[PDB]
Every structure is written in C-alpha cells, then in structure tokens.
Assembly symmetry: C3
Homo-oligomer: 40 residues x 3
C-alpha cells in the first residue's frame, strides 16, 4: 500500500527524522538518518 | 534550486519514502529508504 | 529531542532534502540525501 505521512519531526540528539504515519492504531512511524545543523 | 515538497507517502512493503515535488509537470519525486516501526 | 518540521524542500541539483525546524532562532534545518527523478 501507499501509506500517508501525517507530520515530521527531527531530533538533533539522535540525528533521526521521524515521520508519523496514517496507519493502523496511529503509532507507526518511519525513521531515517539525517544531518542537523544551524545554518547561516 | 530547492522546490517545495507537496507530500510524503511511504510504501508498506519496502518502507521507501516518496516526496512529490511542486515543480514543472508535477511528476518529479525524491526518494529514500527508511525504517518503519511501532511505538508506545 | 524531536522538534517539528515546519517546511520541507528538495533541491534537484544537490539531491538533498532540507527540513526547516521549529527550534531556537529558527535557522536550524535537517538534510538528507535522496534519489531525485521524473516519474512515468
Ligand atoms: C534542533 C535541535 O537540534 C539539537 O541542537 C538538539 O539538541 C535539540 O533538541 C533540537 O532537536
């Protein structure tokens, strides 16, 4: 299936972004490595 | 030059994450792999 | 800690997504590599 993403967050401690999914009981997420930094 | 992401979707079987780009003919996408899992 | 992504863009020539983050002076972002392409 194609599973819709509801919203995103990212964490500078873990260097993970997390997508909340519209699926099942509402507590599934998708997660991936990201860089995080203060820009200019 | 960066363009808006219109939406995110996530495949149920591969956990491939697809971002639909607002640009030109509307058929451009971005893609990456993710880990999907169930939380508390 | 997880902070909201307020905006999401993708850059075709760099193959990078940039997430803008709701934190601090508002210049925090997150970035990851992506495949970019035109769909059928
Ligand atoms: C965007 C920020 O990134 C790092 O500085 C973290 O220590 C914060 O919790 C926040 O996630």
């Amino acid at each position: 299936a194609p599973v819709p993403v509801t919203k995103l967050v990212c964490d500078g401690d873990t260097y993970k972004c997390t997508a909340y999914l519209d699926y099942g009981d509402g507590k599934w997420v998708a997660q991936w490595d990201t860089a995080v930094f203060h820009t200019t």
